[PDB]
Amino acid sequence: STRVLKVDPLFPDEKVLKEAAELLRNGEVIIFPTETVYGIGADAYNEEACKKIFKLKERPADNPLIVHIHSFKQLEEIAEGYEPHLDFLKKFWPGPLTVIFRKKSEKIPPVVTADLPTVAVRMPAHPVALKLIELFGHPIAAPSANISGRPSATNVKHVIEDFMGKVKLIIDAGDTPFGLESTIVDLTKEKPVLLRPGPVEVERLKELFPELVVPDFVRKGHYAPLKPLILVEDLTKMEEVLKKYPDHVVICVEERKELYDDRIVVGSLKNPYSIAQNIFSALREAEKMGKEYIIVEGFEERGILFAVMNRLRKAATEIVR
Ligand SMILES: C[C@@H](O)[C@H](NC(=O)OP(=O)(O)OC[C@H]1O[C@@H](n2cnc3c(N)ncnc32)[C@H](O)[C@@H]1O)C(=O)O
Ligand SMILES: [Mg+2]
């Protein structure tokens, strides 16, 4: 019997958080907001509880979980070799950044890290997440709140779609600020490696780390709707595509809304953060509009839209370059 408890994002009712903390202590899984996407979390030191996350998501065991912390002191408990990067961390944490370090803790079971000698760590800039972790007293292991393969939940409506009846508690703090998962940066190798683009933008990381490596899998290509998805990087072929795929809905920017008939406006190029904020909602709307094909306009591989494109490329059933 899933309880959905609404809380203020800045000053959440600590009584709701306590209820959540209790469930975590009982080895239950709960869903909570962050500034990026909703997470589905368990006690990070509880092997059995973390196993439930995999079951509930229908997730491969080889796909490791991000461990969420509230203090730099917790970092010492779980990781080693981070001391040269403390200046960096203190500049972006709390915030939408996940970093890979060598695993110290034997407190974090292998299921969490998929037997890897590394651990992904994030200190989320969302008062609800921070206050929950602190009150609970252990780190929380949490992937995104969605059935594996599907778009990451950015609001409680999407969470309910995927998890009503399957978890005891969803904390609702409204639509997540960014709409997109944290930037993941691997700091275990000699040169830092970008594993996932996010709200900490590539251009910013390149300023800080001139030798940042951006693997091919980041630039090429999860987050997938139920209907086939057609991504159109070259918008001159838009007309060809529309006519090739007749029974369709289009996801488009505002400045090209008038150029279609059946269209979801995801946001404006004027304010690209609007596009990031709404893109996953758009895919969930689209898949329900009773059309055979979802057709999405492409975006610049720059700033936050880089992250958007990363997500769409990984979701698309066909790309049109
Ligand atoms: C809940 C919210 O904080 C959200 N979490 C999230 O997106 O979790 P998830 O859906 O599990 O994505 C986790 C990603 O993190 C990577 N990952 C985790 N631990 C890793 C490790 N030790 N080495 C490399 N990649 C790792 C996984 O491969 C995967 O791509 C976020 O990071 O914004
Ligand atoms: Mg995910």
> Structural domains in the chain?
3-214 (3.90.870.10), 220-320 (3.40.50.11030)
49: tokens are 């509880």
Helix (H) or strand (E) run with residue 202 in it: helix 202-208
β-strand 193-196 against 3-6: which pairing, if any? unpaired
Q: Which ligand is nearest to the CA of 63?
A: 1
For 266, half-sphere exposure in the C-beta direction (CA atoms, 13 angstrom radius) is 29
The finding on whether 146 has its CB within 6 A of some atom of ligand 1 is no
Please name the amino acid found at residue 165.
G
What sign has the CA pseudo-torsion 73, 52, 152, 315? positive
Best of 144, 146, 186 for a ligand 1 pocket test (most atoms within 8 Å of beta carbon): 144
Strand order in the sheet with 293-297: 263-267, 248-253, 293-297, 229-232, 318-320
Count of C-beta atoms within a 10 Å radius of residue 150: 23
Q: How far apart are CA 284 and CA 168, in angstroms?
A: 23
Contacting residues for 183 by C-beta, under 8 A, at least 6 apart: 96, 97, 98, 194, 196, 197, 198, 199, 200, 201, 205, 307
Could you tell me which residues come within 8 angstroms of residue 248 by beta carbon, excluding any fewer than 6 positions away?
A: 230, 242, 262, 291, 292, 293, 294, 295
170, β-bridge pairs: 4, 31
CA torsion sign, 79 to 80 to 86 to 88? negative
Q: Within 10 Å of residue 257's Cβ, how many Cβ atoms?
A: 14
Cβ within 8 Å of residue 148, ≥6 positions away: 57, 58, 59, 60, 63
Query: Rounded to whole angstroms, how far apart are CA atoms 242 and 239?
Result: 5
Phi, psi (degrees; rounded to nearest 5) at 43: -45, 120
Query: Residue 143: CB within 6 Å of ligand 1?
Result: yes
DSSP reduced 3-state for 171: strand
Buried b (16+ CB within 10 A) or exposed e, 272-282: bbbbbbbbbbb
**110 phi and psi angles, rounded to 5 deg:** -60, -30
Indicate if ligand 1 lies below 6 Å from the C-beta of 310: no
Give the Å distance between the CA of 213 and the centre of ligand 2.
Answer: 22
| Ligand 1 atom at minimum distance from 41 CA | 1
Cα-to-centroid distance, 310 and ligand 1 (Å) = 15
| Nearest bound ligand to the CA of residue 99 | 1
Nearest ligand to the CA of 60 is 1
3-state secondary structure of 204: helix
- How close is the Cα of 309 to the center of ligand 2, in Å? 15
Experimental method: X-ray
Resolution of the experimental model in angstroms, please?
2.0
Q: In this structure, are residues 234 and 298 in contact, taking their beta carbons and an 8 Å threshold?
A: yes
Under a CB-based contact definition with an 8 Å cutoff, are residues 80 and 106 in contact? no
Question: Is 152 labeled as ligand-binding?
Answer: yes
Tell me if 118 is assigned to a ligand binding site. yes
User: Ligand 1 pocket test: which of 97, 162, 171, 184 has the largest number of ligand atoms within 8 Å of its C-beta?
Assistant: 184
Show the tokens assigned to 146.
Answer: 């969605």
SS3 297: strand
Q: Using CA atoms, how far apart are residues 183 and 200, in angstroms rounded to an integer?
A: 6
